CSV table of C-alpha atoms and ligand atoms in Angstrom, one decimal:
chain,number,residue,atom,x,y,z
A,1,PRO,CA,-71.1,-5.4,-8.2
A,2,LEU,CA,-68.7,-3.3,-10.1
A,3,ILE,CA,-70.1,-0.5,-12.4
A,4,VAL,CA,-70.2,-1.3,-16.1
A,5,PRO,CA,-68.7,-0.1,-18.4
A,6,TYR,CA,-65.7,-0.8,-16.2
A,7,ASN,CA,-62.0,0.3,-16.9
A,8,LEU,CA,-59.3,-2.1,-15.3
A,9,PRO,CA,-55.8,-0.3,-15.7
A,10,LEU,CA,-53.0,-2.9,-16.5
A,11,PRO,CA,-50.1,-1.0,-15.1
A,12,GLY,CA,-47.0,-1.2,-17.4
A,13,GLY,CA,-49.0,-3.0,-19.9
A,14,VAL,CA,-49.5,-6.6,-20.7
A,15,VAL,CA,-46.7,-9.1,-20.7
A,16,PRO,CA,-46.5,-12.8,-21.3
A,17,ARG,CA,-47.7,-14.6,-18.2
A,18,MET,CA,-50.2,-12.2,-17.2
A,19,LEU,CA,-53.4,-13.7,-16.4
A,20,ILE,CA,-56.8,-11.5,-16.4
A,21,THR,CA,-59.7,-13.0,-14.5
A,22,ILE,CA,-63.3,-11.6,-14.9
A,23,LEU,CA,-66.0,-13.0,-12.9
A,24,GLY,CA,-69.7,-11.9,-13.6
A,25,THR,CA,-73.2,-13.0,-14.4
A,26,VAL,CA,-74.9,-12.5,-17.8
A,27,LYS,CA,-78.0,-10.4,-17.7
A,28,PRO,CA,-81.3,-12.1,-18.6
A,29,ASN,CA,-82.0,-11.4,-22.3
A,30,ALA,CA,-78.3,-10.3,-22.8
A,31,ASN,CA,-77.5,-9.1,-26.3
A,32,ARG,CA,-73.7,-8.3,-26.2
A,33,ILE,CA,-70.6,-8.4,-24.1
A,34,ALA,CA,-67.2,-6.8,-24.8
A,35,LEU,CA,-63.8,-6.8,-23.6
A,36,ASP,CA,-61.3,-4.1,-25.0
A,37,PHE,CA,-57.7,-4.5,-24.3
A,38,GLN,CA,-56.8,-0.9,-25.3
A,39,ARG,CA,-53.6,0.9,-26.5
A,40,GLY,CA,-54.6,4.5,-26.2
A,41,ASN,CA,-57.5,5.0,-28.6
A,42,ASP,CA,-56.7,1.8,-30.3
A,43,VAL,CA,-58.3,-1.6,-29.4
A,44,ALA,CA,-55.6,-4.2,-29.4
A,45,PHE,CA,-58.0,-7.2,-28.8
A,46,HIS,CA,-61.7,-6.7,-28.7
A,47,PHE,CA,-63.6,-9.9,-27.6
A,48,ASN,CA,-67.3,-9.7,-28.4
A,49,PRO,CA,-70.0,-12.1,-27.6
A,50,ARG,CA,-73.0,-11.5,-29.6
A,51,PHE,CA,-76.2,-13.5,-28.2
A,52,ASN,CA,-78.4,-12.6,-31.4
A,53,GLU,CA,-76.6,-11.9,-34.6
A,54,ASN,CA,-79.1,-13.0,-37.1
A,55,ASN,CA,-80.4,-15.5,-34.7
A,56,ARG,CA,-77.0,-16.9,-34.0
A,57,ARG,CA,-74.7,-16.7,-31.1
A,58,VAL,CA,-71.1,-15.8,-32.1
A,59,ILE,CA,-68.0,-14.4,-30.4
A,60,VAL,CA,-66.5,-11.8,-32.8
A,61,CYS,CA,-62.8,-10.6,-32.2
A,62,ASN,CA,-60.9,-7.9,-33.9
A,63,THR,CA,-58.6,-4.9,-33.6
A,64,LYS,CA,-59.3,-1.2,-34.0
A,65,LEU,CA,-56.4,0.9,-35.4
A,66,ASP,CA,-56.9,4.5,-36.0
A,67,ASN,CA,-60.6,4.3,-35.5
A,68,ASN,CA,-60.8,1.4,-38.3
A,69,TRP,CA,-61.9,-2.1,-37.4
A,70,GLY,CA,-59.7,-5.0,-39.0
A,71,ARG,CA,-60.5,-8.4,-40.0
A,72,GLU,CA,-63.0,-10.2,-37.8
A,73,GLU,CA,-62.1,-13.5,-36.3
A,74,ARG,CA,-65.1,-15.5,-35.4
A,75,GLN,CA,-65.8,-18.6,-33.0
A,76,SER,CA,-69.2,-20.4,-32.9
A,77,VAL,CA,-68.4,-22.1,-29.7
A,78,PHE,CA,-70.4,-19.8,-27.4
A,79,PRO,CA,-70.0,-20.6,-23.7
A,80,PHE,CA,-72.1,-17.7,-22.2
A,81,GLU,CA,-75.5,-18.1,-21.2
A,82,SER,CA,-78.2,-15.4,-20.2
A,83,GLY,CA,-78.8,-15.2,-16.5
A,84,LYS,CA,-75.8,-17.3,-15.6
A,85,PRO,CA,-72.4,-16.8,-13.9
A,86,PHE,CA,-69.2,-17.0,-15.8
A,87,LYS,CA,-65.5,-16.8,-15.7
A,88,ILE,CA,-63.3,-15.5,-18.2
A,89,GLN,CA,-59.6,-16.0,-18.1
A,90,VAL,CA,-57.3,-14.2,-20.5
A,91,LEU,CA,-53.8,-15.4,-20.5
A,92,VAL,CA,-51.4,-13.4,-22.3
A,93,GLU,CA,-49.0,-15.8,-24.2
A,94,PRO,CA,-45.9,-14.6,-26.3
A,95,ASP,CA,-47.9,-14.6,-29.5
A,96,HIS,CA,-51.6,-14.6,-28.6
A,97,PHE,CA,-54.1,-13.8,-26.1
A,98,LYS,CA,-55.4,-17.2,-24.8
A,99,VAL,CA,-59.0,-17.1,-23.6
A,100,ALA,CA,-60.8,-19.7,-21.4
A,101,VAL,CA,-64.4,-19.3,-20.2
A,102,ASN,CA,-65.7,-21.5,-17.3
A,103,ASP,CA,-62.4,-23.4,-17.2
A,104,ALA,CA,-62.6,-24.5,-20.9
A,105,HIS,CA,-60.3,-23.3,-23.6
A,106,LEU,CA,-62.4,-21.0,-25.9
A,107,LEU,CA,-59.9,-19.3,-28.5
A,108,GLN,CA,-56.6,-17.7,-29.1
A,109,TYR,CA,-56.1,-14.2,-30.8
A,110,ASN,CA,-52.8,-13.7,-32.5
A,111,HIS,CA,-51.2,-10.2,-31.4
A,112,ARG,CA,-51.9,-7.6,-34.1
A,113,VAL,CA,-50.7,-4.9,-31.8
A,114,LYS,CA,-47.2,-5.8,-31.0
A,115,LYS,CA,-46.3,-3.1,-28.4
A,116,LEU,CA,-47.5,-5.4,-25.6
A,117,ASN,CA,-46.2,-2.8,-23.1
A,118,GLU,CA,-48.5,-0.1,-24.5
A,119,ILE,CA,-51.7,-2.1,-24.2
A,120,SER,CA,-52.3,-0.7,-20.7
A,121,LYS,CA,-56.0,-0.9,-19.8
A,122,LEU,CA,-59.0,-3.2,-20.4
A,123,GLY,CA,-62.6,-2.1,-20.7
A,124,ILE,CA,-65.5,-4.3,-20.0
A,125,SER,CA,-68.9,-3.5,-21.2
A,126,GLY,CA,-72.1,-4.8,-21.9
A,127,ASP,CA,-75.0,-7.0,-20.7
A,128,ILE,CA,-73.3,-8.4,-17.5
A,129,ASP,CA,-73.3,-7.8,-13.7
A,130,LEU,CA,-69.6,-7.6,-13.1
A,131,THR,CA,-68.5,-9.2,-9.9
A,132,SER,CA,-64.7,-8.9,-10.2
A,133,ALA,CA,-61.8,-8.1,-12.6
A,134,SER,CA,-58.3,-8.5,-11.7
A,135,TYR,CA,-55.1,-9.9,-12.9
A,136,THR,CA,-52.0,-12.0,-11.5
A,137,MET,CA,-48.8,-13.5,-12.9
A,138,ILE,CA,-48.6,-17.2,-13.6
B,1,LIG,O1,-65.4,-6.0,-35.8
B,1,LIG,C1,-65.9,-5.8,-34.3
B,1,LIG,C2,-66.7,-4.6,-34.4
B,1,LIG,O2,-68.1,-5.1,-35.2
B,1,LIG,C3,-69.1,-4.0,-35.3
B,1,LIG,S1,-68.4,-2.7,-36.5
B,1,LIG,C4,-68.1,-3.7,-37.8
B,1,LIG,C5,-69.0,-4.1,-38.7
B,1,LIG,C6,-68.9,-4.9,-39.8
B,1,LIG,C7,-67.6,-5.2,-40.0
B,1,LIG,C8,-66.6,-4.8,-39.2
B,1,LIG,CL1,-64.9,-5.3,-39.4
B,1,LIG,C9,-66.9,-4.2,-38.0
B,1,LIG,C10,-69.4,-3.6,-33.8
B,1,LIG,O3,-70.3,-2.3,-33.9
B,1,LIG,C11,-68.1,-3.0,-33.2
B,1,LIG,N1,-68.6,-2.6,-31.7
B,1,LIG,C12,-69.2,-3.3,-30.8
B,1,LIG,C13,-69.4,-2.6,-29.9
B,1,LIG,C14,-69.9,-2.9,-28.3
B,1,LIG,C15,-70.0,-1.7,-27.6
B,1,LIG,C16,-70.3,-1.9,-26.1
B,1,LIG,F1,-70.6,-0.9,-25.4
B,1,LIG,C17,-70.7,-3.3,-25.7
B,1,LIG,F2,-71.2,-3.3,-24.5
B,1,LIG,C18,-70.5,-4.2,-26.7
B,1,LIG,F3,-70.8,-5.6,-26.2
B,1,LIG,C19,-69.8,-4.1,-28.0
B,1,LIG,N2,-68.6,-1.5,-30.1
B,1,LIG,N3,-68.2,-1.6,-31.3
B,1,LIG,C20,-67.4,-4.3,-33.0
B,1,LIG,O4,-67.8,-5.4,-32.3
B,2,LIG,CL1,-71.9,-6.0,-30.7
């Protein structure tokens, strides 16, 4: 397994048609997972499954600019399961990141950070065993 937190460089930044695939297994009794597409210290796209936020399971998405979180976008479809293997696919489209989990579309996140070429690393953190993280062009 890859060591978490894991940094996946995205050479030259992201571009439409870039597909990121993450395979892992959620730990038993998991609390949180995060993907952070970063532009330097800024987080262009934070994707954050929370397994127990006031006894609800929710995915929180946001952007961090100059150390300030913005407006949260929340999704109650929650496809992660403690103890179970998952696949996350993040497809960069021209106007949003498009996320599917276990082959089912989950959400889209409109680009707030518009210098896509400067979003040149992906951090993967939280309560998973990380099997692989890679990218390809579709
Ligand atoms: O809005 C999104 C933000 O919400 C609050 S801050 C907040 C509170 C209220 C309103 C607003 Cl707008 C913001 C989180 O504390 C923020 N977070 C989570 C993690 C984190 C770190 C890990 F190492 C990890 F493994 C993991 F899964 C998550 N780091 N930072 C973030 O999720
Ligand atoms: Cl969290």
